[PDB]
Amino acid sequence: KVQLKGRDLLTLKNFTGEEIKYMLWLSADLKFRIKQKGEYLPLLQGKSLGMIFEKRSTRTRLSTETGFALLGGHPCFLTTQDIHLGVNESLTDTARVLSSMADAVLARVYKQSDLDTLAKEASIPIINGLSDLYHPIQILADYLTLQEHYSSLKGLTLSWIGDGNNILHSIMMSAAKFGMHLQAATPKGYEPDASVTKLAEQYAKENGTKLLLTNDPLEAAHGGNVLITDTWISMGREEEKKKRLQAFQGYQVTMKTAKVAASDWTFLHCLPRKPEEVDDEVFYSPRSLVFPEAENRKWTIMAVMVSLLTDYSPQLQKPKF
Amino acid sequence: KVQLKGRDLLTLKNFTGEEIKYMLWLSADLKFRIKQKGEYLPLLQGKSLGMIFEKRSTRTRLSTETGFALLGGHPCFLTTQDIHLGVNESLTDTARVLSSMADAVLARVYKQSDLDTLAKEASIPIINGLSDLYHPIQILADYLTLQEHYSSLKGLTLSWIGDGNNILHSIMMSAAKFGMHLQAATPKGYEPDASVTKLAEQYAKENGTKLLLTNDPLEAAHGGNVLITDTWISMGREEEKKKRLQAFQGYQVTMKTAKVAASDWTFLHCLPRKPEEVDDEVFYSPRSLVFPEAENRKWTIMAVMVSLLTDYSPQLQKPKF
Amino acid sequence: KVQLKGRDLLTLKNFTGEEIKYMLWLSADLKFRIKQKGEYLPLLQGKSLGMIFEKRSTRTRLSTETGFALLGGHPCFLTTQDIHLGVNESLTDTARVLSSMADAVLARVYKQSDLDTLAKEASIPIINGLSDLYHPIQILADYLTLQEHYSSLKGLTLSWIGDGNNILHSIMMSAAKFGMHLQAATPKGYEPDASVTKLAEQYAKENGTKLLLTNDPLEAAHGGNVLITDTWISMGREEEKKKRLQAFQGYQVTMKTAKVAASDWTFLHCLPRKPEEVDDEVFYSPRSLVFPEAENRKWTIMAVMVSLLTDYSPQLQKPKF
Numbered sequence: 006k007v008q009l010k011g012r013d014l015l016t017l018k019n020f021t022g023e024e025i026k027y028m029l030w031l032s033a034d035l036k037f038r039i040k041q042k043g044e045y046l047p048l049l050q051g052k053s054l055g056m057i058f059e060k061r062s063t064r065t066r067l068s069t070e071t072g073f074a075l076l077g078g079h080p081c082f083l084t085t086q087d088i089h090l091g092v093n094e095s096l097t098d099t100a101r102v103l104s105s106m107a108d109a110v111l112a113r114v115y116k117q118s119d120l121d122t123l124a125k126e127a128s129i130p131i132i133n134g135l136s137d138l139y140h141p142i143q144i145l146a147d148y149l150t151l152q153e154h155y156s157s158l159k160g161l162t163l164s165w166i167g168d169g170n171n172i173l174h175s176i177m178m179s180a181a182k183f184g185m186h187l188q189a190a191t192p193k194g195y196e197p198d199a200s201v202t203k204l205a206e207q208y209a210k211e212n213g214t215k216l217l218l219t220n221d222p223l224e225a226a227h228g229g230n231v232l233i234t235d236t237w238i239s240m241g242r243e244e245e246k247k248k249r250l251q252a253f254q255g256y257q258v259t260m261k262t263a264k265v266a267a268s269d270w271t272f273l274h275c276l277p278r279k280p281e282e283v284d285d286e287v288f289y290s291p292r293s294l295v296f297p298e299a300e301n302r303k304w305t306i307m308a309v310m311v312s313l314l315t316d317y318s319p320q321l322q323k324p325k326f
Numbered sequence: 327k328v329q330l331k332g333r334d335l336l337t338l339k340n341f342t343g344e345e346i347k348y349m350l351w352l353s354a355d356l357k358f359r360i361k362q363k364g365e366y367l368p369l370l371q372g373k374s375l376g377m378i379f380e381k382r383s384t385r386t387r388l389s390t391e392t393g394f395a396l397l398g399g400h401p402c403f404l405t406t407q408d409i410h411l412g413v414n415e416s417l418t419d420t421a422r423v424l425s426s427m428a429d430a431v432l433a434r435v436y437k438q439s440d441l442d443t444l445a446k447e448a449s450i451p452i453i454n455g456l457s458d459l460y461h462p463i464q465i466l467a468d469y470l471t472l473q474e475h476y477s478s479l480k481g482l483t484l485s486w487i488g489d490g491n492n493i494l495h496s497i498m499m500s501a502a503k504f505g506m507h508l509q510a511a512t513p514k515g516y517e518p519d520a521s522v523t524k525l526a527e528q529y530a531k532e533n534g535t536k537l538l539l540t541n542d543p544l545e546a547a548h549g550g551n552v553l554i555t556d557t558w559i560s561m562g563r564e565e566e567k568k569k570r571l572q573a574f575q576g577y578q579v580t581m582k583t584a585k586v587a588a589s590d591w592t593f594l595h596c597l598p599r600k601p602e603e604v605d606d607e608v609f610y611s612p613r614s615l616v617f618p619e620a621e622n623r624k625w626t627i628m629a630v631m632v633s634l635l636t637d638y639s640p641q642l643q644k645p646k647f
Numbered sequence: 648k649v650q651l652k653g654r655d656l657l658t659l660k661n662f663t664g665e666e667i668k669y670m671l672w673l674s675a676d677l678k679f680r681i682k683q684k685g686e687y688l689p690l691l692q693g694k695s696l697g698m699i700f701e702k703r704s705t706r707t708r709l710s711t712e713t714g715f716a717l718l719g720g721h722p723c724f725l726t727t728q729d730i731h732l733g734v735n736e737s738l739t740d741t742a743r744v745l746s747s748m749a750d751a752v753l754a755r756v757y758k759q760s761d762l763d764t765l766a767k768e769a770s771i772p773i774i775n776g777l778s779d780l781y782h783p784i785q786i787l788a789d790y791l792t793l794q795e796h797y798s799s800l801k802g803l804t805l806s807w808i809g810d811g812n813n814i815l816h817s818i819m820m821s822a823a824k825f826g827m828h829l830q831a832a833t834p835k836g837y838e839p840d841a842s843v844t845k846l847a848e849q850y851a852k853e854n855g856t857k858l859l860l861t862n863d864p865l866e867a868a869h870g871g872n873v874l875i876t877d878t879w880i881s882m883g884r885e886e887e888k889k890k891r892l893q894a895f896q897g898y899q900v901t902m903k904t905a906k907v908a909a910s911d912w913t914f915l916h917c918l919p920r921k922p923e924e925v926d927d928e929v930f931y932s933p934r935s936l937v938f939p940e941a942e943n944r945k946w947t948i949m950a951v952m953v954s955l956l957t958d959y960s961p962q963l964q965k966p967k968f
């Protein structure tokens with residue numbers, strides 16, 4: 006049915022609901038076998054990963070590095086200051102050299118087009134470790150965390166309040182494929198990419214889900230089962246701090262926000278979190294799934310790597326989505 | 327009897343003589359099995375370590391990284407420039423995320439209070455990789471090196487000449503627990519922390535050992551079995567170079583220093599060494615145990631990790647202390 | 648016959664034709680067993696490597712790191728910004744500490760004399776990862792790539808056009824030992840080291856091969872089976888960009904260069920490549936072996952490490968040289 010071996014993972018728009026559910030099934034299987042049963046599964050023995058990071062990272066870095074190694078493989082952390090990329094060398098040449106020396110690449114970049122060049126020029130899987138446009142592997146952790154909390158995903162309403170950034174784009178490329186509704190509030194002038202919105206409208210129509218884009222936080226939060234935010238100033242945007250602090254006033258998630266949400270509301274944030282987007286009462290609430298979510302970055306990137314590099318079949322019963 | 331699994335190791339003041347002897351016993355066992363018998367002991371297979379370094383390191387870095395990996399685990403080297411800590415993220419949040427992704431953390435920091443926050447907020451063992459206040463794992467290497475040289479430790483006199491810094495504080499938190507005497511000379515105004523001195527007086531009283539603090543190098547060296555020094559300008563103190571070079575004149579360890587020491591005198595230095603604290607004749611003397619000492623940083627951090635993360639029992643006969 | 652265990656590899660002038668052929672035989676054996684047969688060969692299990700890099704690297708870094716780990720060992724990446732070297736610590740002391748903590752060192756340096764100090768002061772193998780004077784492990788990859796292309800090496804003419812740098816010096820220390828001829832063109836004032844040239848004349852005489860040094864690109868290319876170039880501005884020489892761009896005009900390798908070469912001509916470049924030394928038509932030609940060559944950096948550094956640290960014997964039939 007689902008065949009993911011050898012594929013790239015640059016964005017969730019290139020994946021069906023069934024393929025993304027397969028990745029969450031494998032995540033749950035690997036988490037059960039290793040975290041709960043204590044098995045050692047050397048599924049990536051004799052394999053290596055090239056990790057290119059052009060931006061800082063705590064969770065993507067740790068989850069990917071300890072995750073690849075936990076399956077018996079060798080992760081190699083490469084930064085801008087150590088390798089030749091950009092300066093003495095082109096991306097086409099870097100891509101061909103990585104192909105012959107590693108079995109896959111995870112790259113945290115600025116330009117999504119750099120991930121496209123890497124996928125075209127390399128003959129090994131390229132995984133997006135976050136770009137300015139999309140962050141697909143974050144949403145894998147998010148939807149596994151919500152399936153574990155609610156015991157299913159179909160019919161949940163996701164309520165985004167914040168910037169029209171990479172995280173919202175990845176939710177837009179995937180929520181309807183799971184039968185989930187999306188209500189998203191951004192400041193005026195900080196909307197999601199018109200092309201992404203257009204494709205999210207199509208997915209909503211195909212799956213019979215709702216998509217609401219607004220500038221009002223309480224309209225996005227109304228009836229939502231999950232409240233979701235992120236920093237107002239993403240990496241590479243620090244020059245705009247002053248303008249963004251002014252434009253985003255009134256967009257902090259608080260218990261006033263939650264009062265309008267469904268009674269079973271929970272909260273997500275990809276982290277790192279700052280005091281601006283959400284207050285401490287919601288961030289550290291018993292309803293906040295932020296640290297479960299962060300943990301699931303590890304079991305989901307392990308599943309991505311196993312599905313793109315092996316023919317391993319999940320032993321676990323498929324979770325209810 | 328001794329149970330160390332799950333504990334943090336932030337300072338040796340939180341450890342009894344019997345617990346620290348257990349760590350040196352395990353070090354000796356692991357050194358004998360792997361270095362001498364050539365066994366491969368995958369005791370930390372399926373485990374990972376988060377290594378946070380806010381300061382430079384050659385020995386703590388190499389001993390910890392090659393040591394964790396030699397036992398089958400995966401070490402992950404994280405610096406200030408790569409992870410979000412300090413800048414985009416709090417230590418509480420970093421601590422909770424590390425907990426769900428690694429099995430332990432070793433952190434070389436400035437503030438000991440940062441290690442306290444990490445231990446309180448993480449549910450996994452936190453090991454001090456050096457702070458401004460204490461460096462417990464250095465003293466583990468030091469006392470293993472002296473037990474190997476002398477075939478026991480009880481009744482030795484340690485003679486510190488130098489700054490009232492982290493290394494002297496760690497010796498003060500541990501020497502009396504082994505029945506060792508301490509005679510320490512620092513410049514006036516560069517004494518050890520009054521709280522540490524107070525607690526070292528109490529340990530000396532409980533164990534019936536002597537504690538002498540002086541400003542005279544030859545008084546500290548008199549009758550000492552081990553001469554010990556370190557840099558006059560510790561990491562983070564480079565602004566004070568001029569004032570310290572002036573204040574520490576006359577505190578260089580030389581053969582004049584050694585003439586006053588016991589006939590079986592040896593020499594220790596945690597490294598890196600500069601020409602100021604000790605001359606070449608003592609540093610490279612046959613009595614200098616500096617490079618044995620540096621090697622034992624590896625077998626002792628391996629023992630720390632095995633004792634805090636497993637239920638492994640030493641097969642070796644307990645060494646005489 | 649050949650015994651390489653415990654030796655350093657600082658330059659190919661310290662190696663006979665038979666010893667270098669042994670290293671290419673082991674490379675071919677390891678490539679066949681692991682890449683083609685898919686075997687997992689944990690030959691360096693329980694071993695570690697200290698990797699000191701004072702300059703940037705993509706290929707030496709990846710090939711060495713994934714290569715050491717593919718054989719079951721642990722590679723440790725150490726940079727100038729993380730370890731004490733240069734600043735708080737001497738190379739003699741760093742060398743002795745590395746000896747007791749790792750099983751070998753690979754170091755990419757500026758001064759070849761730093762590699763000499765490391766080899767004298769350490770009791771473990773020191774491998775040159777590139778210095779200003781020599782880059783021996785590059786030529787191992789190059790000659791394996793040419794043996795795979797041509798099915799033998801004896802009698803080939805290597806045609807260097809470019810700077811009288813580390814790569815040309817390493818070709819000069821080795822081509823005649825394989826019965827290969829060398830014709831090399833550099834700009835006036837940018838010749839190879841007079842001592843290296845002198846020793847290359849002696850090797851040419853002992854092996855009955857030709858050695859031609861010229862300032863004319865087409866004289867170096869005439870009748871050559873392999874065209875070889877590299878950057879005009881090596882790492883550490885960026886201050887000389889203006890003077891070198893002017894002095895090296897007319898030294899770009901093009902199809903005009905190739906028109907003069909033997910009919911079976913191929914092309915090599917150690918990478919990273921810039922547009923100055925060679926054009927796109929030659930670089931991306933079907934005759935360009937640049938990306939095969941880059942891959943073989945991995946199988947040859949694996950063979951170096953296995954031959955200096957173990958008693959493993961190649962199972963493969965010896966390749967024809």
Ligand SMILES: N[C@@H](CCCNC(=O)CP(=O)(O)O)C(=O)O
Pocket residue numbers: 061062063064065066135140143170171172235236238239240275276277410
């Ligand atoms: N919009 C934010 C998203 C950060 C995602 N965070 C993570 O993936 C967690 P990490 O940075 O610790 O790996 C930005 O682009 O800056």
Ligand SMILES: N[C@@H](CCCNC(=O)CP(=O)(O)O)C(=O)O
Pocket residue numbers: 382383384385386387456461464491492493556557559560561596597598731
């Ligand atoms: N008082 C000194 C102690 C240095 C300890 N050295 C070590 O642990 C050896 P390393 O720095 O190579 O890891 C200071 O605080 O600067």
Ligand SMILES: N[C@@H](CCCNC(=O)CP(=O)(O)O)C(=O)O
Pocket residue numbers: 089703704705706707708777782785812813814877878880881882917918919
């Ligand atoms: N003459 C050049 C040689 C570069 C060698 N390149 C390599 O070894 C490939 P890498 O730098 O990606 O490891 C110089 O000294 O700059």
